[PDB]
Design a protein around this ligand. Structure first.
Ligand SMILES: O=c1cc(CP(=O)(O)O)c2cc3c(cc2o1)OCO3
Ligand SMILES: [Zn+2]
Ligand SMILES: [Zn+2]
Length: 229
């Protein structure tokens, strides 16, 4: 059940979880879809990733207003590329508290991104330091190691079977690992496996550029990344 809302697509994944999808014409690659998440936690809404642009991200907020009609308490963005952070200004214009890996905020200006307002830091084992992610409700934030980028982070949704790999994970039939321009090729495979081990009960793996898949997306992405070293 895809719902077309202007130029964006929304798909319900669970009673309190929806996937948002936006598109950007990349010259040389066609119109590239990017996915994020919208989660209702009681009387508030939590967002994972912006759309590619401010205008598209404002449209996500419009869809939330019409379809959920609860305040958006926070957004967390999963690395400093345009598909995930390109709409930061729209979140700030709306008064929404924003969070990203400290490293994503450090990298944002040179990537042409606007930094989030708050920085997440991570324990040695990858789990977010909880003091830096206050009021995250069911969102469980995990840094799996460098992969698609050095700053990529991932998010599980407690109380569901869903985990979000962002651009780290590709679907079980993907031919390649996509844009490796900022990737850590040596560590990618281990980081993909660490994501899987952090969320062992997640049977629905959501990712940036493909429809949700089974855990075969993780095993396949890791096996593909094995070839990178
Ligand atoms: O420089 C880039 C950056 C991105 C965004 P990201 O996905 O790496 O976060 C990008 C995305 C694409 C692509 C090429 C790309 O080139 O082709 C299919 O999707
Ligand atoms: Zn990226
Ligand atoms: Zn991507």
């Amino acid at each position: 059940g895809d719902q077309r809302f202007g130029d964006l697509v929304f798909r319900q994944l669970a009673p309190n979880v929806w996937q948002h999808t936006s598109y950007l014409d990349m010259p040389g690659f066609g119109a590239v879809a990017s996915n994020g998440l919208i989660v209702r936690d009681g009387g508030r809404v939590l967002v994972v990733d912006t759309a590619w642009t401010d205008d598209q991200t404002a449209q996500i907020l419009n869809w939330i207003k019409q379809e959920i009609n609860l305040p958006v308490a926070l957004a967390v963005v999963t690395h400093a590329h345009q598909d995930k952070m390109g709409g930061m200004d729209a979140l700030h214009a709306a008064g929404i508290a924003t969070y990203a890996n400290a490293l994503s905020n450090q990298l944002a200006p040179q990537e042409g991104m606007v930094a989030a307002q708050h920085s997440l830091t991570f324990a040695a084992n990858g789990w977010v330091e909880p003091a830096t992610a206050p009021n995250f409700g069911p969102l469980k934030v995990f840094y799996p190691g460098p992969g698609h980028t050095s700053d990529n982070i991932t998010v599980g949704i407690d109380g569901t079977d869903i985990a979000f790999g962002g651009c780290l994970i590709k679907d079980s039939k993907a031919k390649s690992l996509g844009n490796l321009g900022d990737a850590d090729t040596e560590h990618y495979a281990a980081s993909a496996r660490a994501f899987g081990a952090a969320f062992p009960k997640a049977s629905m793996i959501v990712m940036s550029h493909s429809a949700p898949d089974s855990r075969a997306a993780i095993t396949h992405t890791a096996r593909m990344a094995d070839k990178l070293r």
